[PDB]
Write an enzyme that holds these catalytic residues in place. Sequence first.
Site, PDB file in Angstrom:
ATOM      1  NE  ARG E  40     -12.365 -12.142 -15.713  1.00 44.17           N
ATOM      2  CZ  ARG E  40     -13.619 -11.767 -15.948  1.00 44.17           C
ATOM      3  NH1 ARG E  40     -13.908 -11.015 -17.002  1.00 44.17           N
ATOM      4  NH2 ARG E  40     -14.587 -12.147 -15.126  1.00 44.17           N
TER       5      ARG E  40
HETATM    6  N1  ADP Z   1      -7.976  -4.296  -8.144  1.00 47.26           N
HETATM    7  C1  ADP Z   1      -8.380  -4.235  -9.536  1.00 47.26           C
HETATM    8  N2  ADP Z   1      -8.222  -2.996  -9.959  1.00 47.26           N
HETATM    9  C2  ADP Z   1      -8.528  -2.674 -11.228  1.00 47.26           C
HETATM   10  N3  ADP Z   1      -8.999  -3.619 -12.068  1.00 47.26           N
HETATM   11  C3  ADP Z   1      -9.163  -4.888 -11.639  1.00 47.26           C
HETATM   12  C4  ADP Z   1      -8.861  -5.203 -10.396  1.00 47.26           C
HETATM   13  N4  ADP Z   1      -9.115  -6.522 -10.227  1.00 47.26           N
HETATM   14  C5  ADP Z   1      -9.577  -7.007 -11.382  1.00 47.26           C
HETATM   15  N5  ADP Z   1      -9.610  -6.008 -12.272  1.00 47.26           N
HETATM   16  C6  ADP Z   1     -10.079  -6.647 -13.333  1.00 47.26           C
HETATM   17  O1  ADP Z   1     -11.151  -7.663 -12.994  1.00 47.26           O
HETATM   18  C7  ADP Z   1     -11.043  -8.593 -13.904  1.00 47.26           C
HETATM   19  C8  ADP Z   1     -11.111  -9.944 -13.268  1.00 47.26           C
HETATM   20  O2  ADP Z   1     -12.370 -10.158 -12.722  1.00 47.26           O
HETATM   21  P1  ADP Z   1     -12.574 -11.479 -11.750  1.00 47.26           P
HETATM   22  O3  ADP Z   1     -11.934 -11.229 -10.412  1.00 47.26           O
HETATM   23  O4  ADP Z   1     -11.926 -12.672 -12.401  1.00 47.26           O
HETATM   24  O5  ADP Z   1     -14.174 -11.776 -11.544  1.00 47.26           O
HETATM   25  P2  ADP Z   1     -14.790 -13.279 -11.307  1.00 47.26           P
HETATM   26  O6  ADP Z   1     -14.625 -13.677  -9.864  1.00 47.26           O
HETATM   27  O7  ADP Z   1     -16.265 -13.281 -11.666  1.00 47.26           O
HETATM   28  O8  ADP Z   1     -14.056 -14.267 -12.187  1.00 47.26           O
HETATM   29  C9  ADP Z   1      -9.557  -8.412 -14.661  1.00 47.26           C
HETATM   30  O9  ADP Z   1      -9.764  -8.043 -16.070  1.00 47.26           O
HETATM   31  C10 ADP Z   1      -8.941  -7.505 -14.078  1.00 47.26           C
HETATM   32  O10 ADP Z   1      -8.224  -6.638 -15.094  1.00 47.26           O
END
Ligand code: ADP
Lengths: 134, 64, 123, 123, 91, 182, 68, 275
Positions: E40
Site C-alpha cells: 500500500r
Molecule cells: N489506480 C491504481 N493504479 C495502480 N495501482 C494501484 C492503484 N490503486 C491501488 N493500487 C494499489 O492497490 C493497493 C491498495 O489496495 P486497496 O485499495 O487498499 O484494496 P482493499 O480495499 O482490499 O484494502 C496499493 O498497493 C496500491 O499501490
Amino acid sequence: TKKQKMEVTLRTPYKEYLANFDGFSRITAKTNEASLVIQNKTPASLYVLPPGPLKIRFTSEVKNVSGDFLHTGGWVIVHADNTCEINVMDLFDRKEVRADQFEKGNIQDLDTLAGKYAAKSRKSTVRLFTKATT
Amino acid sequence: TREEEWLDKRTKSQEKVYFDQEDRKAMKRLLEKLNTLEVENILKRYHINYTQALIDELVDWKTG
Amino acid sequence: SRMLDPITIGEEHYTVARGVQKLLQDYKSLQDIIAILGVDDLSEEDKLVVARARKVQKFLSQPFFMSEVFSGIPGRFVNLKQNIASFKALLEGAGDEYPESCFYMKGDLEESLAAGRADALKS
Amino acid sequence: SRMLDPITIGEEHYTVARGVQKLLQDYKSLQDIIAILGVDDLSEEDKLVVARARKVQKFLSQPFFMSEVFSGIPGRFVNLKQNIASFKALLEGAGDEYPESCFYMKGDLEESLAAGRADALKS
Amino acid sequence: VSAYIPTNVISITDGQIFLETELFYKGIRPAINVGLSVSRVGSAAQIKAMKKIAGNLKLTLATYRELAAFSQFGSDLDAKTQQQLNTGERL
Amino acid sequence: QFLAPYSGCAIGEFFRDNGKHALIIYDDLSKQAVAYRQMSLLLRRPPGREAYPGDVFYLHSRLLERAAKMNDSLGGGSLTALPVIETQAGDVSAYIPTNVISITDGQIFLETELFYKGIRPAINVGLSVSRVGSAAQIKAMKKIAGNLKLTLATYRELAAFSQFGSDLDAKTQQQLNTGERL
Amino acid sequence: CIEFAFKKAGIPIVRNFLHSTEGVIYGLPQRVQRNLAINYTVKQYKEGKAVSAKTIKTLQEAFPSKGD
Amino acid sequence: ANLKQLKIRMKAIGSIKKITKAMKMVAASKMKAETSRLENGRNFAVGSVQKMLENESYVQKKKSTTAPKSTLLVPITSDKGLCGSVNSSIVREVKRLALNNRSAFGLLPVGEKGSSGLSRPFPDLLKSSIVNIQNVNFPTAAAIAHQVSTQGAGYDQVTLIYNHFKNAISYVVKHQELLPRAQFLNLFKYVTRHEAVEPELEYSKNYFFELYMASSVYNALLNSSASEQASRMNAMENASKNAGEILSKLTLDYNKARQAKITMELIEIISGASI
Ligand SMILES: Nc1ncnc2c1ncn2[C@@H]1O[C@H](COP(=O)(O)OP(=O)(O)O)[C@@H](O)[C@H]1O
C-alpha cells in the site's frame, strides 16, 4: 529393346490429360525454327516448344478434350523406345481464349539487356495467339 | 499442474508480439501521413549539423 | 446497473454500451484459439475484433487523483458526453489506425490521438 | 533438508544439488503439455531439458540389499564422492547419448555407461 | 491461499510477499512472485534515488513474464523482443 | 418470507377451483428455503446437508404440487407455477436445486455467458426441457417446432468448429450459417 | 527468341514462359492465372539477419539474369 | 482439494480438446486438397531426363563415373508448427548424416521448423533458407530449383530430404540424389541418340537441366505437403484423445473432492449443532 506401335503422354503440373494414349494418329507443333510433326516411328530427338499451338488428331473422340490447345511452354522428348512425352506448364482450349484482354497493366518493362528479350518474347506470343484464334 | 496459466501466458505473449509489429507500421503510416529560432539560422549558415540538445543549451546559456 | 435500460437512458448510450460488451465477449473466446495458433492464423474479421477489443479494453483504464502517488500521472475527469462519444468513435473504427499503446490511461479519445501524433514527431 | 546449504557442505555439492533440482523442476513444469502432446513439437532447448531429466530420473533409482528378493538384483552402496561425481558428469552431458534404460537401477554412473555401451554394441 | 486463516491475514495486513516453490527450485532465490506481491505504501517509502529506478524496473519485469510463453513457441524472435527477453533475464 | 408463497398459492386456487385459469410466479423461491432454514436452526432442529432441515424437500413439494390442471368436473380451471432459483456457481448439483428440479417437470436454464454474447433472452436450449412438449403447443407450432429443435441440436454440435468456417469443406459451413440465422 | 534470350542474357526457359504469358495472363482463364503465382520468403540465416520476400518472379527476383 | 482450482483446469483441458478436435477437421480438409493436387501432378516428367539419358548408350560409354566428395543437402520441412512428427524426423536424419562428418554439406534448409531446428546445432553451416511458401506450383518450384542450382555449383552433388506420402496415415522419409549443373552439362553434351537441332544443344542442355531439377523439387514439395496435413491430422487425433483421457481423470477427482467438501462442511455444522 523395343516398344509397341506408340505411346504418348501429355502431362501438366496441375493436371494429367493423357498418362498413355495410342489412338492418336499424328502430332504437330511449332518450334523456334519451324513447325514439326511427330508420329509413329519418329526417331529419337529432343524438342522445346515455345508458347504455341498444339494440334493432335484422334482416331476415336476423347472426352473433355478438343484436340486443339494453346500451351504456355513445354518440353518434348522422344525416347528410344518409340515414345514421345509432352510436358507443358499449362494447357487450355481455344474456345476459352478470351481474346482482346491482353495488355492490362503488364505493358511496362525495364530497359535492360534482359528486359529486351522479355518484351521481344511477349510481343512474339501476342502476335502468335492472335493468329491462333483464327 | 497449471494449464490455465499456460494458455493465458501464450495468449498474452503471442498477441503482444503480433500487435507490437503492428504498432511500428501504425506509427510509420500515420507519421508519413502527417508529414504530407535565431540559433537555428546562424548554425545553418556554417552548415554544421546541430542536435536539439545543443540548441537548448545555447538558448539556456543566453537566458541564464 | 439497473439503469442500463434503453428506455431509462438514451438509446445511443445503451447501444454503445452493448457494442463494447459484445466486442469484449468475442475477444475473450478468441483467446483460446489464439493461445495455440496465434493472431496470425485468425481471419481478417477476427483480427479486427481482437485489435479494437484490446484498444477498448486498455482505453477503459483511467488515472484518478488518488492513484497519482502510485502511478505519477495527474488524475483526470471525463464527462458523460465525451465518454459516450469517445467509445462510439472507437466502435466505428476511428482509432483503428493508431497504435493500441496510446489508448491506455487516457481520459478522452482526443487525448489519445494527440499523444499518438506526439510520439510520431518524437521519433 | 536443513543440511543443504553452501556453507555447511562443500560448495560443489550445493551446485550439483541445485543443478538436478533445477533440471527436474523445469521438466516438471512441462509434464502437463507433454501429456497432451508429445515432445516432438517441443523447442530444442526444452527438449534437451526433458531428455536429460529422464536420464537423471532413471539414475536416481537403485536396488537395495533388503529389497533384493523383490527385484531379484543385488543392492548397491553409493559413496558420497561417487554420488557427487556421478551426477556432475551426467549434468554435463556425459551419458546423454546412451539410452535412458541403462541408468535404471544402477549404483554408479560408470555402471550405467557399461550397460549403455553394451546395449549399443549388441545392436 | 483461499483457506480461511490466510485469507483473513491478507486482508488485515497492507502487503503480502508470496513465496513460490517452483521459483525456489528453478534457482530463483529469494523465490518471490512479483506478480502478486504489492504494498500500500508504494513509492511513498522509497528514497528519491530508488523511486526513479524502481518504477522502470517493474514495467520491464512485467513484460518479461509475458514473453516467457513465446520462448517455448520460438521459431522466430523480433530484434526488440530478443532484447526485452534478454533484458528481463538480467533482472 | 416463508408464508408468502403459500399465501399467494391459495389466491390462485380460488381461480382454479372456480374454473378460471391463473398464473402464479414465486420470485426468489430459494430465499424461502433460507428463511425456513433460519427458523429451523434458531429452533435448534437437527440440521442436514448445507444446514437445511430434513424436510426442506417436503417444503417445496407440498407447495408446487398444489398447482395443477383441474378436470372439467370442478370447472376446468388451472394454476401455472413459475418458481425462480438462483444458482451461485451455475452448479445444479447443490442441495436445493436438485430438490426443485426433481419436483418440477422441466427447468429453463439461463446462462450468464450467453447474455454477455448478446443472446437476449439468454436461454440455454441445451439444458431447457419441457416434459409436456408438443402436447402443449398448438397444432400450428408442433410441426415447425420439431424441425427447429433438430436444426439447433445439430448446430450446437457443430458450434465447436464455428471459428473454422472457411477452412472446413462445403455442406457444413452452410449448416453453421443457417443456425446463426435461427 | 528463346535461344538468344538465354545466350546473350541469363534468362532461363521458365522465366521466359512467365514473361511470355505475362502479357496474356488476363486473356487466359482464371484457372491458369492462379497457377502463375510465386510468393515465398528467403532468409539469410542468422537469428534475425535478413528476411527477403520473393514476389516479383519476372525480374531478377526469382530467376536472376545477366541483363538485370 | 480446492474444487475451484480443479474445475478451472478441467475447463482448460476442455477447450484444448475442443480446439484440438477442430484443428483435426481442418487437417483432414486440407489433406484432401493436397492429395487431390498430388494425384494430379504426381509423376510429372519424373525420370524422363533420367530415362532418355539411360537410353543414350554412347553417353554411358563416356559417362564420368566418380564419387562426389562435396554435396549439398536441402531438407524439406513444414513452416507451420504443431504439424506432427514429420519435421522432427527430417531434422533428425539430416542431423545424423551431418553431425557424423562436418564441412562436407551446405545444408540449405527449407521450412521454418527445418531451418530453425538446425540453426543451433549447425551454426555457420546453413546460410540461407526458404520459408513462408504461399502455395505449391511449378513456377515456384522452378524458382526454388533455380536457387538450388546457383548454390549447387560449390558442391559436387545435391540431394533432397523430404517425407514421402505413401498413405494417408503412413509417411516415410525419402531422399533423392541429383547431380549439379556442371556435372549435368558435361554429361549432356555426350547426348547423340536423341537429336536436338530445333533448339541447338548449347540451349537444350541448359533448358532440360531446369526440367530435370524442377521436376524433382516440384514432386518433393507435394509429397511433403501431403505428409504435413496427414501427420497433422493424426497428431490432433492423438492430442484430442489424450486431452479427453486427462479431462475424464480430473472429473473423477472433482467428484471425489466434491464428496469430501460436503463431508467436511457437514461435520462442521453438526459439531456446532451438537453443543
Ligand atoms: N489506480 C491504481 N493504479 C495502480 N495501482 C494501484 C492503484 N490503486 C491501488 N493500487 C494499489 O492497490 C493497493 C491498495 O489496495 P486497496 O485499495 O487498499 O484494496 P482493499 O480495499 O482490499 O484494502 C496499493 O498497493 C496500491 O499501490
